[PDB]
């Protein structure tokens, strides 16, 4: 019923658990968003994505704005109808992948081989029918000089204001969707503070920590999160973009993050990597050829209820589509079970113990 | 409950409809068997294969005997457990693909780059836990001289007797599975008769028409079926190997065939060809880019209940796994709906009219 309502039900240290209520559904936080690259979570029907426990998916905009195109998807009834996912979708701005997959940069926006600006990005996300819209920003490369990081962040803040204005100008979008801003500033505490101040001044429904998971490594990422997350408004969701491995997620939650997206469970799945409570395994390895156990001994997913490591080993080695399907369903389910354990442990005031127990076993 | 019981419930001309009862399930005839190439019906979970209406699948033996190997599959609990399909499986002998995918031929069997003989084939199928076992034969190439066809057929008949003996020697196989013989003789009526006589003398649970769908074309295939099928025992199932397109199936049923297998619905599915009552379409074609209709307007499958041509067009053009999944599920469901319409129309004594109506619309 509500457009966007974030409620925090429980806390432990910097960690929070709660819910975001939106018109298309409730999102339990901390949340993991499976990534839909070109209007599909690779190798999964939407009903299967939901069966794993996902409340919301991320829709990449960059590919969709090229093919089939945002106007075409709108003509076909919007992204939800098009792909058959009726729950919330968070769309990215399209700019991150422009820089990584295409470019000419200016104050207006980015030209690439088309022009993408804050205004055009917001309109594209509107045409897709996004529930959570990301402001159009610039992900500062790493490493960056303080001066380069500063000028980059400042441009992102101007683009954040333009994103806000474009979103607010579209009545139907403002009434039915939410808008998140993205903090920049590289690894520099003062710039992160200036960025947080600028975003709070403008005002958003949620705040992402941008500019991380770009090669800096976990120690440095955690160091930056240590000071950066407390700068954001406490009463709104905190979203860490493009993170990450299970241990990255646990540590980020310990530091105040409420939302995550990553291609790892899907991409790894197709490549033969399965996540387990005892760490990742490569199912192609010969040691699994006669292993009748499920991928993970505790996992509640449909794959682990029915098929053996030996069978999935065979499928992946044979290049069979079903191999990709089963690995992906399991990995996404594993990620959702991780999030559920995180939510329950915070709710119960035993998250610290969970984090310690998780790491001891995962890295044994 | 029974090992193998074929009952004919209704007839119209040469067409029959009925059931084969086996320990793992009932098979409604005329039946279409989706093909499982390497212990998977490509891009489908077994539950989805069943949801389309399939009563039985065909398991290719050739690939499995190489990897993971028949002894390994037996150690892992058999093919049914391995792949998660608990209903009947018909296994081929492995010899057809040896000739088409690998060879040295002799009276003992075939050597290839391993030796495959009637005895080894039967043992492999036993290790897999097959419900319907195919005799090991030789598919005569087309065209063939009468003398070459004759010597080839005669060798197949000797191999059929050896297959029978090997099957009967394995108590557990003889008690729980069925054995089909394969008629040869190329396009020659006298040789087809000699082959049928030899097979009936030995005695099988079912009889396949071999040596067809090997380049002869539909007119010639139908011509050979016209005289060949009546030579087989009327009271046992008739199985046409490797057929075929929807119109091939309808015409073969008109000529007395009860069982079919073909890679077309699965293989075509992955390649972008969808079967419809108005003929096949290629979903990649630009004309489908904004088409909100389902693949077929009447189809009862889950794919046609939920997704548009436009979406599947997008998926297939993007090389997305979900595209292969949806196309394959629809095509297999379409084939099963065809078989259901065939069964109902024969039961109701209106199959002739159905065949005419089907062809008029399919080829309009
Ligand atoms: O500042 C950002 N602004 C807008 N989008 C982003 C997306 C981002 N994605 C990553 N990292 C992705 C890490 N992946 C891990 C798996 O393999 C692919 C890379 N960092 C990101 C930062 C930003
Ligand atoms: O005498 C036979 N003996 C044992 N196995 C067979 C398998 C057979 N498979 C075909 N034809 C297959 C036709 N396919 C159509 C679809 O594209 C691939 C070929 N004909 C066949 C004949 C025999
Ligand atoms: Zn699992
Ligand atoms: Zn359909």
Q: B28 CA distance to ligand 4 centroid (A)?
A: 21
B1-364: CATH topology: TIM Barrel (3.20.20)
Which are the catalytic amino acids of B? 92, 261
Question: Which residues contact residue B98 at a Cβ distance below 8 angstroms, ignoring those fewer than 6 apart?
Answer: B62, B110, B112, B116
Cα gap A168→A150, rounded to integer Å: 27
> Within a 10 A sphere around the Cβ of B159, how many other Cβ atoms?
25
How many angstroms separate the CA atoms of A135 and A286, rounded? 46
Inter-chain touch B311–A43, beta carbons under 8 Å = no
Walk across the sheet containing A110-111 and list its strands.
A104-105, A110-111, A115-116
Q: How far apart are CA B265 and CA B337, in angstroms?
A: 13
CB contact under 8 A, A322 and B44: yes
User: Token pair 């190329």 is at which residue?
Assistant: B186
Contacts of A174 (CB under 8 A, 6+ apart): A167, A168
Q: In which residue are the tokens 């897709």 written?
A: A128
Euclidean distance between CA atoms A130 and A23, whole angstroms: 12
Residues of B with CB under 8 A from a CB of A: 38-40, 42-45, 63, 67-68, 72, 75-77, 82-84, 289-290, 292, 306-308, 310-311, 314-315, 317-318, 320-322, 324-325
**Of residues B22, B27, B37, the one with CA closest to residue B91:** B37
| Nearest partner of B101 among B145, B66, B70, judged by Cα | B66
Inter-chain touch A75–B290, beta carbons under 8 Å: yes
Catalytic one of A55, A131, A205, A261 = A261
Number of residues that make up chain A: 364
Three-state SS across B179-190?
EEEEECCCCCHH
| Residue B192 to residue B196: CA distance in whole angstroms | 6
Domain boundaries, chain A: 1-364
Q: Atom 12 (ligand 1): residue with closest C-alpha? A: A242
Rounded distance, CA A91 to CA A121, Å?
10
A52 in Cβ contact with A23 (< 8 Å): no
* Ligand 2, pocket residues at CB < 6 Å: B 92, 96, 137, 139, 182, 210-214, 241-242, 262-264
Inter-axis angle of helices B321-347 and A321-347, to 10 degrees? 110
Q: Locate the ligand 1 atom nearest the alpha carbon of residue A182 and give its number.
A: 3
Smallest CA separation from ligand 1 atom 4, residue: A96
Nearest CB to B320: which of A40, A76, A322? A40
Q: Name the β-bridge partners of A182.
A: A208
Please give the Cα distance from B48 to B51 (Å, whole number).
Answer: 5
Q: Is B56 helix (H, G, I), strand (E, B) or coil?
A: coil
CB atoms A320 and B38 under 8 Å: yes
SS3 track for B2-28: CCEEEEEEEEECCEEEEEEEECCEEEE
**DSSP string covering B119-138:** HHHHHHHHHHT-SEEEPP--
Distances from the Cα of B329 to the Cα of A208, B245, B324, angstroms: 40, 17, 8
User: Which ligand neighbours the alpha carbon of A294 most closely?
Assistant: 3
| Contacts of residue A339, Cβ cutoff 8 Å, sequence gap at least 6 | A28, A30, A31, A32, A53, A249
Q: Who contacts A50 (Cβ-Cβ below 8 Å, separation ≥6)?
A: A85, A87
Residue B12 Cα, gap to closest chain A Cα (Å)? 40
Residue A145's φ and ψ, nearest 5 degrees, are -70, 155
Q: What are phi and psi of B152, to 5 degrees?
A: -60, -50
Q: Residue with structure tokens 């196989």?
A: B173
Q: Three-state DSSP class for B59? A: strand
Per the CB < 8 A criterion, the answer to whether A240 and A252 are in contact is yes
DSSP line for B88-105: -EEE--SHHHHHHH--EE
Cβ neighbors of A164 (< 8 A, separation 6 or more) are A135, A179, A181, A202, A203, A204
Cross-strand pairs, B89 = B57
Angstroms from B315 CA to nearest CA on chain A: 8
Task: Report the 10 Å Cβ neighbour count for B286.
Answer: 8
- Do B244 and B264 contact (CB within 8 A), yes or no? yes
Distance CA B21, CA B5 (A): 5
For residues B263 and B261, what is the distance between their CA atoms, to the nearest angstrom?
A: 7
Q: Whose CA is nearest to atom 9 of ligand 1?
A: A242
Q: What are the φ and ψ backbone dihedral angles of A321, each rounded to 5 degrees?
A: -55, -40
Separation of A214 CA from ligand 1 center, angstroms? Answer: 6
Q: Which phi and psi angles does B177 have, rounded to 5°?
A: -120, 175
Contact B283, B326 (CB under 8 A): no
Between B264-271 and B321-347, two packed helices, what is the crossing angle to 10 degrees?
140
Q: Is B139 annotated as a binding residue?
A: no
CB-based contact B311 A83, cutoff 8 Å = yes
B206 touches B132 (CB < 8 A): yes
Instruction: Quickly count: other Cβ atoms within 10 Å of residue A157's Cβ.
Output: 24
Q: Which of A67, A306, A310 sits opposite B84 (nearest CB)?
A: A306
d(CA B153, CA B211): 10
Tokens 């890295």 map to which residue?
A: A363
Task: Collapse the DSSP code of B116 into the 3-class scheme (helix H, G, I; strand E, B; otherwise coil) and give the result.
Answer: strand
Q: Nearest residue of B to residue A291 by CA position?
A: B76
Structure tokens at A222: 């955690």
Q: Which helix (H) or strand (E) holds B332?
A: helix B321-347
**What is the DSSP code string of B223-292?**
HHHHHHGGGS-TTS-EEETT--SHHHHHHHHHTT--EEE-SHHHHHHHHTEE--TT--EETTSGGGTT--
Instruction: Give the separation between CA A99 and CA B272, rounded to whole angstroms.
Output: 32
List the structure tokens of A50.
């939901």
DSSP structure class, residue B35: E
Residues of B in contact with A308 (CB under 8 A): 76, 82
Which residues, including other chains, have CB under 8 Å from residue B190's CB and lie 6 or more apart?
Answer: none
Q: How far is the CA of B346 from the centre of ligand 2 (A)?
A: 26
Tokens of B176: 């729980």
The dihedral formed by the CA atoms of A44, A50, A52 and A57, expressed in degrees to the nearest 10: 80
Site from A41, A76, A322, A326 to mutate, B interface, most B CB atoms within 10 angstroms: A322
After which residue numbers is chain B interrupted with C–N beyond 2.5 angstroms? 102, 113
CA A324 to chain centre: 21
Burial class (CB in 10 A: 0-12, 13-18, 19+), A161: middle
Ramachandran angles phi, psi of B181, nearest 5°: -95, 160
Tokens of B216: 């002869």
Interface contact A72-B290, CB threshold 8 A? yes
Instruction: Output Rg (C-alpha) for chain A, integer angstroms.
Output: 20
Which among A36, A39, A40 is the top mutation candidate for probing chain B, defined by the most B β-carbons within 10 Å of its own β-carbon? A40
Q: With helix as H, strand as E and coil as C, how does chain A read?
A: CCCEEEEEEEEECCEEEEEEEECCEEEEECEEECEECCCCCCCCCHHHHHHCCCCCEEECCHHHHHCCCHHHHHHCCCHHHHHCCCCCEEECCCHHHHHHHCCEECCCCEECCCEECHHHHHHHHHHHCCCEEECCCCCCCCCCCHHHHHHHHHHHHHHHHHHHHHHHHCHHHHHHCEEEEEECCCCCHHHHHHHHHHHHHHCCCEEEECCCCCCCCHHHHHHHHHHHHHHCCCCCCEEECCCCCHHHHHHHHHCCCCEEECCHHHHHHHHCEECCCCCCEECCCHHHCCCCCCCCCCCCCHHHHHCCHHHHHHHHHCCCHHHHHHHHHHHHHHHHHHHHHHHHHHHCCCHHHHHHHHHHHHCC
3-state class of B57 per DSSP?
A: strand
- Residue A91 pairs in a beta bridge with A59, A133
- Spatial distance between the Cα atoms of B215 and B46, rounded to a whole number of angstroms: 32
Whether the ω angle into residue B244 lies within 30 degrees of 0, i.e. cis, is yes
User: Mutating which of A46, A75, A270, A325 best tests the B interface, going by the most B Cβ atoms within 10 A?
Assistant: A325
Distances in whole angstroms, Cα of residue A61 to Cα of each of A65, A91, A92, A157: 6, 6, 6, 21
User: Strands A115-116 and B89-91: what pairing?
Assistant: unpaired
Instruction: Give exposure, A193-204, as e/b (b: 16+ Cβ within 10 Å).
Output: ebbbebbbebeb
Q: Give the C-alpha distances (Å, rounded to integers) separating B104 from A115, B97, B114, B157.
A: 64, 14, 10, 19
Instruction: Chain B: give the shortest CA distance to residue A240, in Å.
Output: 27
Give dist(CA A123, CA B168) in Å, integer.
72
Compute the distance between CA of residue A5 and CA of residue A198 in angstroms, rounded to an integer.
22
Closest partner residue to B42 among A40, A314, A321, by Cβ?
A: A321
Terminal-residue alpha carbon distance, chain A? 45
Q: Sheet containing A89-91: which strands, arranged edge to edge?
A: A31-33, A259-261, A238-240, A206-209, A178-183, A132-134, A89-91, A57-59, A35-36
Distance separating the N- and C-terminal Cα atoms of chain B: 45
- C-alpha–C-alpha distance, residues B296 and B305, integer Å: 10
Distance CA A92, CA A139 (A): 12
List the residue whose alpha carbon is closest to atom 2 of ligand 1: A210
Preceding omega of A99 cis (within 30 degrees of 0)? no
Residue with tokens 């960056």: A144
The DSSP element (H or E) to which B32 belongs, if any, is strand B31-33
Query: What are the distances in angstroms from CA B266 to CA A173, B40, B55, B56, B102?
Result: 42, 11, 16, 15, 23
Residue A238 is encoded by which pair of tokens? 């905190």
What is the position in ligand 1's atom list of the atom closest to the CA of A139?
1
Chain A positions in Cβ-Cβ contact with residue B290 (cut-off 8 Å): 72, 75-76
CA distance A207 to chain B (A): 32
In the structure, ligand 4 is a single-atom ion and the residues with CB under 5 Å from it are B 299, 301, 303-304, 330
Establish how many alpha carbons lie within 13 A of residue B322's alpha carbon, considering only the half-sphere containing its beta carbon.
27
| A-B contacts at Cβ under 8 angstroms | 92
Comparing CA positions, the residue from A132, A343, A306 lying closest to residue B82 is A306
Measured from CB, residues less than 6 Å from any atom of ligand 1 are A 92, 96, 137, 139, 182, 210-214, 241-242, 262-264
């Amino acid at each position: 019923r509500p457009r966007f309502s974030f409620s925090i039900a429980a806390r432990e240290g910097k960690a929070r658990t709660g819910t975001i209520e939106m018109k298309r559904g409730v999102i339990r936080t901390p949340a993991f968003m499976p990534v839909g690259t070109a209007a599909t979570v690779k190798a999964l029907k939407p009903e299967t994505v939901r069966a794993t426990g996902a409340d919301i998916i991320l829709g990449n905009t960059y590919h969709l704005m090229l093919r089939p195109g945002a106007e075409r998807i709108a003509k076909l009834g919007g992204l939800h109808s098009f792909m058959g996912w009726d729950r919330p979708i968070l769309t990215d701005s399209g700019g991150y992948q422009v820089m990584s997959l295409s470019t000419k940069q200016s104050e207006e926006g980015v030209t690439f081989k088309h022009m993408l600006s804050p205004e055009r990005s917001i309109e594209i996300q509107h045409l897709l029918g996004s529930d959570i819209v990301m402001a159009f920003d610039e992900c500062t490369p790493y490493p960056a000089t303080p001066s380069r990081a500063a000028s980059s962040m400042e441009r992102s803040m101007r683009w954040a204001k333009r994103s806000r204005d474009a979103f607010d100008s579209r009545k139907e979008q403002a009434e039915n969707a939410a808008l998140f801003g993205i903090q920049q500033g590289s690894v520099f505490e003062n710039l992160r503070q200036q960025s947080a101040d600028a975003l709070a001044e403008i005002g958003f429904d949620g705040y992402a920590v941008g500019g991380l998971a770009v090669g800096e490594g976990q120690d440095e990422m955690f160091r930056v999160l240590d000071f950066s997350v407390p700068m954001l408004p406490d009463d709104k969701p905190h979203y860490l973009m493009g993170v990450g491995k299970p241990d990255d997620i646990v540590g980020a939650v310990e530091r105040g993050i409420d939302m995550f997206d990553c291609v790892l469970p899907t991409r790894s799945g197709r490549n033969g990597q399965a996540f387990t409570w005892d760490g990742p395994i490569n199912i192609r390895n010969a040691r699994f050829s006669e292993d009748l156990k499920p991928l993970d001994s505790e996992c509640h997913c449909a794959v682990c209820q029915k098929w053996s490591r030996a069978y999935i080993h065979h499928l992946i080695r044979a290049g069979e589509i079903l191999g990709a399907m089963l690995m992906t369903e399991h990995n996404i389910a594993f990620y959702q079970q991780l999030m559920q354990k995180i939510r329950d442990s915070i709710s119960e005031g035993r998250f610290s113990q969970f984090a310690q127990d998780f790491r001891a076993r995962y890295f044994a």
